[PDB]
């Protein structure tokens, strides 16, 4: 059967696209190597931060705000839990974090609601945080935490109810693009459509070559740990925030304990360079997995440094400039690419689903996606 649209990779981006297409009666096939949500890609480990005031760049702010509204819409549409409004705390040494400074500029440029705090004020407001007096902070009360696996699961169920088809456990191996149609090849059969969306996560770094693209995309092994914590300090129930922070040796992101699961932490600016088909997905096989996390906790969040309850191993896919790629294929207007989310895309996946649907159906989008151009110089070595 010939589809209107085929999505290859039904993960964060692809499943959101599938939902957007299905809701409009577009006949859509999604193909995934596994059965999303799953633990082999970039979307597991339960939780993801969404921030609006954006330390990676003030220009992501409208897409973040649109995505936030889309997440509230999803919360209303499903029985799965989507979002909890933890707020997000950003801190770092005063005058020595570009990330903090840009987050502050973004909030002023877009009139976001934030609180500015420094030093002992941070430690006083949130028992359990111990920063030096020379640190400053910006706290965003209305952003928070997404349950990422639930997001994908909900978009899947909703899309499928509207007639989208999802072909699981099926790896796309090659492509054949014509001026007026697209074709995918798999071990389970070949499929055709009018339009293609390519959203294969870390595997974009191996298979975009089949579409005659040569773009630096490096996959990285990124672990997270959940730690037994003082629940009187670090529980969501006592308003402990989500956080993304810069310290002299890099950026860390974390989450309050939800229902006693433990504070969750990840070291964002370091990971191992890997291949997605040979990555070691067992937490704790390198001593850095646990040690890098406790190095942060014992300094800054000392009551959240108990027994390791749970670990996970996830992948980032970085571009050279760490900005996304969201665009048409330069040689094929019937092919849409979503790649290179550089460890910070999940929060936008709802909005990206909308962009991808518009690009597929119309070749354009109402969103400003200029900074994510596939033709930009900074993508290339
Ligand atoms: C790993 C990670 C990422 C992350 C994060 C912490 C960790 C440890 N923290 C984040 C945060 O707090 N907030 C945020 O906004 N983002 C954060 N991230 C990044 C984010 O999770 C990623 O940027 C995002 O998930 C990327 O999504 P994308 O849709 O690109 O990737 P995916 O969900 O893995 O989906 C890809 C799918 O493609 C399928 N696949 C692969 N190969 C094939 C083939 N050949 N054929 C068909 N399907 C294929 C995969 O199976 C997967 O489902
Ligand atoms: Cl990523």
Numbering used by the authors: 2 to 382
The authors write:
(SoxB) recognizes the cyclic imino acids l‐proline (l‐Pro), d‐proline (d‐Pro), and l‐thioproline (l‐Tpr) as minor substrates.
The Tyr254Ala and Tyr254Gly mutants exhibited enhanced reactivity toward cyclic imino acids by eliminating this spatial interference. These mutations disrupted the electron delocalization associated with l‐Tpr, thereby eliminating charge transfer and substrate inhibition.
